[PDB]
Each structure stands twice: as structure tokens, then as C-alpha cells.
Structure 1
Amino acid sequence: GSKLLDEAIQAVKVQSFQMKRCLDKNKLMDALKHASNMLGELRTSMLSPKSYYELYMAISDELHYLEVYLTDEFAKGRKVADLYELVQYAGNIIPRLYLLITVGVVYVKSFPQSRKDILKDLVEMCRGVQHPLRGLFLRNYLLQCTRNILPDEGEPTDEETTGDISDSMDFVLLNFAEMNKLWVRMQHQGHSRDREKRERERQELRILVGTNLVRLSQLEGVNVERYKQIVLTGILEQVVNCRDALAQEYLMECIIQVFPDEFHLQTLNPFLRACAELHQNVNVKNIIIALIDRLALFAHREDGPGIPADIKLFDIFSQQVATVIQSRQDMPSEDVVSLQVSLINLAMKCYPDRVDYVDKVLETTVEIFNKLNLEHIATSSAVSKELTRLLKIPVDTYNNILTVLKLKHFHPLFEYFDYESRKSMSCYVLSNVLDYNTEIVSQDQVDSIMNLVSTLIQ
């Protein structure tokens, strides 16, 4: 029907009109009765995640008019007594806890001495809502209300405040673990024939869970050593143990995106060891590629430190990608080659100087193709698509094409192609050696040009 949503949004507008009416007259307890009736609309189970999301945003925007009313009132000296206690009288838990959170943040601003306890209270008392959808949206509202007021390092030095960065980390890591629990729990609620609908619904809601990680990166006090010992240790504990491909895939990508590259370089072996422990339906290829892509844009950015010499990227990624592929049961051969492309790409952008690395990828790529007892690989096959795209990168990216011919293992890969692709690829390399003019060729490189002709004609 889709009426339910509109009927609800209508009733919200009726009650939020009568709420502000009472707030204009300064009749607070009468306003909180309408606020409660408005919040009653979030108790339903009949809306979809999309519909419910719309209803949430409507009610969230009205709750702000109450939150700002209280904050000003409290800032002007006319603080309402027992308000934290009073809102807990509400019989239904959803209205109660939305109200409690709203009044909670007002207390944190107005009474900095209570900050540690109230935040710790709000995160803990949300355990009352076990229903996945409503629980997620509750714990999301907690996270947005508390955005500005959490402890941090660059703060005003008011020595009656409570709670430090350690409390903020525990606050958000806990709310993270609870929301991820609820979110994974959505996989098993409802009827067994709506498996594809559920995974669609969960996908829509992924941002609610991920905002916790976004919130952890925004804390100034989260330095690299805390990220190593507390934050990533916290996140990776939930990720590997949730045993859920949808969450694992989303969250591991979410880490890469949200935290800086300074943090990624100190935590490479932990992040890649985690990748091997993920569920078999997780696209591990896409996680590793996204990370390498991000570290490449860090290597070429000047007015920044670049990549330290003690962090040997190539030795780490080469050795771990091998270990990650070993952990997979049935990785398509095209994907193994898609990873060799990024290992080249890494070595090209992070170490242009070191050609021997780029050859070592090609040397190991040969070992892969040699180890796999392969039937003749067609040009239409995805393996050939990638091996072509792999070989073209040195040819396309390098300044001087003479340097490509000096690679020992560049040509042996041509063996494995189709007859059509040897002709296509040999033509493509030789055509580029004419499109840019040729200097005198050295002993090793005279050899490689004739080897390219022999694959072209025959």
C-alpha cells in the first residue's frame, strides 16, 4: 500500500506541531507527552527499511527542536530538575530511550562533571532494544546526538570535566559491536524465501554500522599507536568473528576508506592476516586492490612524508597476497591475475626506480601460469583479458620503451596466449617502438625485438 508511511508522517506532523506549541508556551511536560506520542511511531514493525528510514529522519528533525529548546533553556540558567529521571517514566522503551539520549546530551553540555557517566549510561541502556531495525536506528541516533560532545585531545581545559579519549574509544567500539551484531542478526529474521530481499535490505542499512568507524577516525586523539592497539584490534575482533561475508566485505573496505594512509602502513600485516580469515564468499581481491590503490595515491602526493624505507611494501604485499590466495578454496584464475596487475601497479607507482620488482611479478606470474596445468587460453577468456591488461601497463606507463625490452620475463608470458592475442600484443608493443623514435639498441634488447617479431608473424 505505502499508506502506513504517509499516515505515520502525518501523525508526526500533528504531534510535533502540538509539541512546539507547548514549547512556545513553556509547558515542558506537556511537550514531552507529544514528543513521546511522535516517538511511538518508531515502534512499528510494518515499514520496510527505506520507509522506516524516512520516518526516522522526519522524527529526528523534530527531536532537534526539542534538543535545542532544552540546551538554550539550560544554558540560560533555567535548568529543569530531574529531567534525566523524568523521561525514563515512559512505559514504552523506544520513546523512552530516544528521549533519554536527547536529554542526555543536554546534560553532558550543561553538566560536564557528568559526561563520562552519562555517555557510558546511554550506550549501555540501549541494550533494551534487541530488534535489529529499531536497534540499529536507536544506536545510530545515539551516535549522531553524541557527535560533538565525546571526549577528545584538543579540548577546552575545564578541569571539572570527566572522561578522556579512552572512554570515547570504548564508547564507539561498543556501539559498533552492538550495531554489527544487530545488523548480522538481520540475516536470519523473517521467512527463508526472502533471502535475496534481506541481503538487499541489509545492504541499504550498511552506512548505519559504518558510521561508527567514521566516528573513530574523526577523534583527534586516535593516533597511530592507539589505532594499532585499541581501535583496529577492536574492529578486527568483530569482523573476523561475525562470520558474515556481507559485513566482512563491507567493513574491511570501510576501514581502508575511512582511516589515513599513515595508519595503514603500520598495520599492513594485521590487515592482510585478517583478509585470509574472512568468509569464502568475500571478494578478497577487491579489498586488497582498494588498499593498494589508496597507497599508490599516497606515494605520488608531494608535500607529505611518502613511504618510509623500513616499510618494504613490495615484500609485504607479494608475500601476503600469496598467503591470501592460498587461504581461498576456489578463487577464479582471472582474479589471481587481477592481483598480479595491482602488484605491478604497486611496484610501478611506489618504486619507479626498481625495475627488478616489476620483473619479479612477471616471473611469479609465469610460475602461476606454469603451475596451473592450463588448456589453451582463448582471447575471449577473462584470463587473457587480464594478462593483456597486465602486460600493457609497463608498455603504457614507462617513459622510455627500451626499458620494457630489458625485462627478462616479459616475453615468456606470450607463450600462454591465444594465436590471435600473440599477434595483437606483439603488434601493440612493436607499434609503440615506432610511434616513439628509437635510439641504438643494446645486446639484450636487440634480442627481445626479434623475439617479438617471431611471435607476430608465426
Structure 2
Amino acid sequence: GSKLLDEAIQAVKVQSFQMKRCLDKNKLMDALKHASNMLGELRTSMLSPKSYYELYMAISDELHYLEVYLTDEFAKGRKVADLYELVQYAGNIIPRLYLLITVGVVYVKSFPQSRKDILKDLVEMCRGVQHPLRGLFLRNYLLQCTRNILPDEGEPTDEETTGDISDSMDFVLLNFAEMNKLWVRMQHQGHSRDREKRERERQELRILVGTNLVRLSQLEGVNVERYKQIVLTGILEQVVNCRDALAQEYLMECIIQVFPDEFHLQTLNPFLRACAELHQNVNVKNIIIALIDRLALFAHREDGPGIPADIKLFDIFSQQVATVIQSRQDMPSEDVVSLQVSLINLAMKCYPDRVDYVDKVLETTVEIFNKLNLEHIATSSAVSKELTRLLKIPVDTYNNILTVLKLKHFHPLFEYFDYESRKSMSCYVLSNVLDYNTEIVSQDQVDSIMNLVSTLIQ
């Protein structure tokens, strides 16, 4: 019907009108009685995640008018006594905790001495809502209300405040673990014939879980050593143990995106060891590719430190990509080759100098094709698509096309193509050597040009 949604938003607008009305008269307890009635609409199970999201947003906006009423009232010396206790009298838990979170943040601002205990209390008392949808949205509201008030390092030096960066890291990691738990739990609720609908619903709600990792990256006190020992250690513990492909794939990608490259460079072997532990239905190729792509943009960014000499990127990724591929049960051959492309791409952008790296990928690529007892690869096959894209990168990217001809293992890969693609690829290489004018060719490279013609004509 979709009326339920609109009926609720109508009811919300009625109660939120009478709330602000009472707030004008300074009738707080009567305002809260309507705030609770408004919040009562969040108890429903009849709305979809999209419908419920819309209802949440309406109610979140109205709660802000209450939260700002309290914060000013408290700032101007007219603080309401026992208000923390009073909102817990609510007989229904969902109104109770939304009101408790609202009053909690007002207390943190107004009474800095109570900051550590109230935050720890709010994250802990949310355990009351075990329902996935409603629990996720409650814990999300906790995370938004507390955005500006969590402990951090660049803070005003008021020595009556409580709680440090450690308490903030535990606050968000704890909320993260509970939200992920609820989010995964959605996989098993309802009837067994709505499996594709559930995975669709879960997909929509992924942003709620990922905001926790976003919040961890926003903490100025989260340095590289805290990331290594606490934050990534916390995050990876949930990721590998949740045993859920949808969350694993999302959360690993979300790490790459949210944290800086300074942190990624110190944590490569832990991150890639985790990639090998993920569920078989996870696109591990996409995780590894997105990481390499991010480090490539970090190599070419000047007015930054660049890539240290002790972090041997090529040796790390060559070795771990191999190990990850070994961990997969049935990885398509095209995907294995898509990874060779990113290993080339990495080596080109992070080490333009070192041609021997680019050739070692091609040498290993040969070993892969050689090892694989392959029937003839048609031009229409996806393996051919990638091997073509692989070989075109050195030819397209390099300044001087002479340097490509000096590669030892560039040409032995031509063997494995279709007849049609040997002709096409030999032509594409030879065409580019005329499109840009030739200097005199050395002994090694004279041999390579003849081999390219011999593949073109025959």
C-alpha cells in the first residue's frame, strides 16, 4: 500500500507540532510525552528499509529541535535536574533509548566530568534492541549524535573532562561490532524464499555499518601505531569471523577507501593475509585491485612523502597476490590475468625506472599460461580480452616504444593468442613504432621487430 509510511509521517508531524508548542511554553515534560509518542512510530515492523529510512529522517530532524532546545537551556544556567533518569521512565525501549541518547549528549557538553561514563553507558544500554533494522538505526543515531563530542587529541585543555582517545576507539569499535552483528543477522530473518530480497535490503543498509569505520578515520588521535595495534586489529577480527561474503567484501573495500595510504603501507601483509581468509564468494580480485589503484595515485602525488624505500611494494604484492589466488577454490582464469594487469600497473606507476619488474610479471604470466593446460584461446574469450589489455599497457604508457622491444618475455605470450589476435596485436605494436619515428635499433630489439613481423604474416 505505502500508506503506512505516509500515515506515520502525518502522525509524526502532528506530535512534533505539539512538541515545539510545549517547548515554546517551557512545558518540558509535556514536550517529552509527545517526543515519546513521535518516537513510538519507530517501533513498527511493517515498513521496508527504504520506507523506515524515510520515517527515521523525519523523526531525526524533529529530535534535533528538542536537542538544541535542551543544549541552550543547559548552557544558559537553567539546567533540568534528573533529566537523564527521567527519560528512562518510558515503558517502551525504542522511545526510551532515542530520548536517552538525546539527553546524554546534552549532558556530555554541559557536564564534561561525566563524558567517559555517559558515552560508555549509551553504547552499552543499546543492547536492549536486538531487532536488526531498529537496532541498526538506533546505533546509527548514537553515532551521529556523538559525532562532535567524542574524545580526541587536539582538544580544549579543560582538566575536569573525562575520557581519552582510547575510550573513543573502544566506543566506535564496540558500536561497529554490534552493528555488523545485527547487519549479518538480517541474512537469516523472515521466510527462506525472500533470500534475493534480503540481500537487496542488506545492500541498501551497508552505509549504516560503514559509518563506524568512517568515524574511526576522522579521529585525529588515530595515528599509524594505534591503527596497526587497535583499530585495524579490531576491524579485521569482526571481518574474518563474520563469515559473510556480502559484509566481508563491503568492509574490506570500505577500509581501503576510508583510511590514508600512510596507514595502508604499514599494514599490507596483515590486510592481504586477511584477504586470503575471506569467504569463497567474495570478489578478492576487486579488493586487491582497488588497493593497488589507490597506492598508484599516491605515488604520482607530489608535495607528499611518496613510497618509502623499505616498503618493497612489488615483492609484497607479487607474493601475496600469488598466495591469495592459491587460497581461492575456483577462480576464473580471466581474473588471475586481471591481477597480473594491476601488478604491471603497480610496477609502472610506483617504479617507472625498473623495467625488470614489468618483465617479471610477464615472465610469471607466461608460467601461469604454461602451467594452465590451456585449449586454444579465442579472441571472444575473456582471457584474451585481458591478455590484450595487459600487453597494451607497456605499449600505450611508455614514452619510448624501443624500451618495450627490449623486454624478454613480452613476445612469448603471443603464442597463446588466437590466430586473429596475433595478427591484430603484432599490427598494433608495429603500427605504433611507425606512428612515432624510429631511432637505430640495438641488437636485442632488431630481433624482436622481426619476431613481430613473423607473427603478423603467418
What TM bracket, shorter-length normalisation?
over 0.9
- What secondary structure does 1:358 align onto? helix
Shift of residue 224, structure 1, vs aligned partner: 0.2
1:297 positional shift = 0.1
Q: Distance in 2 between matches of 1:44 and 1:306?
A: 52
Shift in Å, 1:14: 0.0
Please name the residue that 2:232 is paired with.
232
CA drift of 1:99 comes to 0.1
Within 5 Å, give how 1:325-336 maps onto structure 2. Answer: 325-336=325-336
CA shift for structure 1 position 305 = 0.1
CA distance in structure 1 between the partners assigned to 2:17 and 2:318 by the alignment: 62
Question: Aligned-pair distance for 1:400?
Answer: 0.1
C-alpha displacement of 1:45: 0.1
Q: Quote the residue 1:250 is aligned against.
A: 250
Where 1:95 maps in the other structure, the secondary structure is helix
> 1:255-276: per-residue Cα shift (whole Å, max 9, x none)?
0000000000000000000000
1:230: how far off? 0.1
Cα offset for 1:39? 0.1
The superposition leaves residues 334-392 of structure 1 with CA deviations (integer Å, 9 ceiling, x where unpaired) of 00000000000000000000000000000000000000000000000000000000000
Aligned counterparts of 1:84 and 1:70: Cα–Cα separation in 2: 12
Hey, what does 2:449 align to over in structure 1?
449
Q: What are the Cα deviations for residues 37-96 of structure 1, in whole angstroms up to 9, with x where unaligned?
A: 000000000000000000000000000000000000000000000000000000000000
CA distance in 2, matches of 1:47, 1:140: 18
**1:293-335 CA-partner distances (Å, limit 9, x unpaired):** 0000000000000000000000000000000000000000000
Displacement of 1:435 after TM fit?
Answer: 0.0
**TM-score, scaled relative to structure 1:** 1.00
Task: Provide the secondary structure at the position in 1 that maps to 2:440.
Answer: coil
Matching residue of 2:219: 219
| Cα distance in 2 for residues equivalent to 1:92 and 1:353 | 67
Query: 1:278 Cα deviation (Å)?
Result: 0.1
Per-residue deviation, 1:445: 0.2
Which residue matches 1:51? 51
For 1:157 and 1:70, how far apart are their aligned partners in 2? 25
Deviation string for 1:201-228 (max 9, x for gaps)? Answer: 0000000000000000000000000000
Render the CA deviation track for 1:178-203: whole Å, top value 9, x for unaligned.
00000000000000000000000000
Counterpart-to-counterpart distance in 2, 1:298 and 1:6: 48
Separation in structure 1 between the aligned mates of residue 163 and residue 129 of structure 2, nearest angstrom = 26
Query: 1:392-407 to 2 correspondence within 5 Å?
Result: 392-407=392-407
Once the two structures are aligned, what percentage of the paired residues are identical?
Answer: 100
1:284: how far off?
0.1
Post-superposition offset of 1:112: 0.1
Q: What is the CA distance between 1:438 and its match in structure 2?
A: 0.1
Q: Distance in 2 between matches of 1:274 and 1:66?
A: 44
Aligned to 2:145: 145
Taking the aligned partners of 1:104 and 1:165, their CA distance within structure 2 comes to 19
SS for the counterpart of 2:65 is: helix
TM-score of the pair, normalised by structure 2? 1.00
Equivalent residues in 2 for 1:103-182, closer than 5 Å: 103-182=103-182
Compute the RMSD of aligned alpha carbons: 0.1
User: Which residue does the alignment assign to 1:364?
Assistant: 364
Q: For 1:118 and 1:397, locate their aligned partners in 2 and report how far apart those are by CA, in whole Å.
A: 57
**1:374-432 deviations in whole A, cap 9, x for unaligned?**
00000000000000000000000000000000000000000000000000000000000
Other structure's SS at 1:56 match: helix
Q: Which deviations, in whole Å up to 9, do the C-alpha atoms of 1:426-455 show, x marking residues without a partner?
A: 000000000000000000000000000000
1:24 Cα offset (Å): 0.4
**What is the deviation of 1:283?**
0.2
Name the SS of the counterpart of 1:303 in structure 2.
coil
Within 2, Cα distance between the matches of 1:374 and 1:446?
31
CA deviation after TM superposition for structure 1 residue 229, in Å: 0.1
Cα distance in 2 between the residues matched to 1:318 and 1:240: 23
The whole-number CA distance in structure 1 between the counterparts of 2:165 and 2:433 is 59
Shift of 1:245: 0.1
Q: Distance in 2 between matches of 1:22 and 1:259?
A: 45
The whole-number CA distance in structure 2 between the counterparts of 1:308 and 1:34 is 59
Report deviation, 1:21: 0.1
Aligned mates of 1:79, 1:336 — CA distance in 2: 64
SS at match of 1:254: helix
SS in 2 for 1:440: coil
Separation (CA, whole Å) in 1 of partners of 2:187 and 2:162:
39
Give 3-state SS (helix, strand or coil) of 2:311's partner: coil
Q: Which consecutive unaligned segments of at least 5 residues does structure 1 have?
A: none
Equivalent runs, 1:433-448 vs 2, <5 Å: 433-448=433-448
Residue 288 of structure 2 corresponds to which residue in structure 1? 288
SS of residue in 1 equivalent to 2:439? coil
Q: Distance in 2 between matches of 1:11 and 1:122?
A: 28
Q: Tell me the equivalent position of 2:276.
A: 276
Size of the aligned set, in residue pairs, is: 458
Q: CA deviation at 1:105?
A: 0.1
